[PDB]
């Protein structure tokens, strides 16, 4: 992982994820939506295993984007949890949870769940 | 489980769940919403382990309600997955997924996730 994780990743819809994996387990970078505009950019922060197992196990990781920047506030945050799998066609496989700020009466509709695959290509 | 599962159960919001657990693993019954009207009643069907382990493990179970009856169609279905824990204050602990029928463009907002506890009291 590490230098294999660093770089640009794309999901099946066209979103772009740019990350630097640091030497002691930090992930920092930006998430850019479809349309690809100069801000549908949002800051991301996360963590990964920097000493992963040596058999063929993937590298466990996760990160958060809060959907506020200088142009937009969508009053929500998404966490992605998954693993990096290296080699010839490297990918990152994730499940995600998206939570919106709600009143306590509407709290039953606060969290959506789905899944995403990122490739280098 | 079985005769311990049969009967009336209540969650923290006041919804009422009525189930018969059958001899070979079937669950059949009705779910009634808050307000408690003569139809906010919906049919449920599910399955449970009828030969559970004999140490203190819970009984694994799940069920589905599609939200259509004679008065209302909400074009959605919920599955509850959990376990029954018996004894002095018996409860059923669940996580649930609620999916709405969407177009493929809106398919990112189809499934909500939450959790529920049912007691006899």
């Amino acid at each position: 992982a590490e230098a294999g994780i660093t770089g640009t990743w794309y999901n099946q819809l066209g979103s772009t994820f740019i990350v630097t994996a640091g030497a002691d387990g930090a992930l920092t970078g930006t998430y850019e939506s479809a349309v690809g505009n100069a801000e549908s950019r949002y800051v991301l922060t996360g963590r990964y295993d920097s000493a992963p197992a040596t058999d063929g196990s993937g590298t466990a990781l996760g990160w958060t984007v809060a959907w506020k920047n200088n142009y937009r506030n969508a009053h929500s945050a998404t966490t992605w949890s998954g693993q990096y799998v290296g080699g010839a066609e490297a990918r990152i496989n994730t499940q995600w949870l998206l939570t919106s700020g709600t009143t306590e009466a509407n709290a039953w509709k606060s969290t959506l769940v789905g899944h995403d695959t990122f490739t280098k290509v | 489980a079985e005769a311990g599962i049969t009967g009336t159960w209540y969650n923290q919001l006041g919804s009422t769940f009525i189930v018969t657990a059958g001899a070979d693993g079937a669950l059949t019954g009705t779910y009634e919403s808050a307000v408690g009207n003569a139809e906010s009643r919906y049919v449920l069907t599910g399955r449970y382990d009828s030969a559970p382990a004999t140490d203190g493990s819970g009984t694994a179970l799940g069920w589905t309600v599609a939200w259509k009856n004679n008065y209302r169609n909400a074009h959605s279905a919920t599955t509850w997955s959990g376990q029954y824990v018996g004894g002095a204050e018996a409860r059923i602990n669940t996580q649930w997924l609620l999916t709405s029928g969407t177009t493929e463009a809106n398919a990112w907002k189809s499934t909500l996730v939450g959790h529920d506890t049912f007691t006899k009291v």
């Binding site: 939506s33 984007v65 969508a74 929500s76 | 990112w108 907002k109």
Partner: peptide, 6 residues
């Protein structure tokens, strides 16, 4: 449609 999507 949410910024994660559009």
């Amino acid at each position: 449609c949410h910024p994660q999507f559009c």
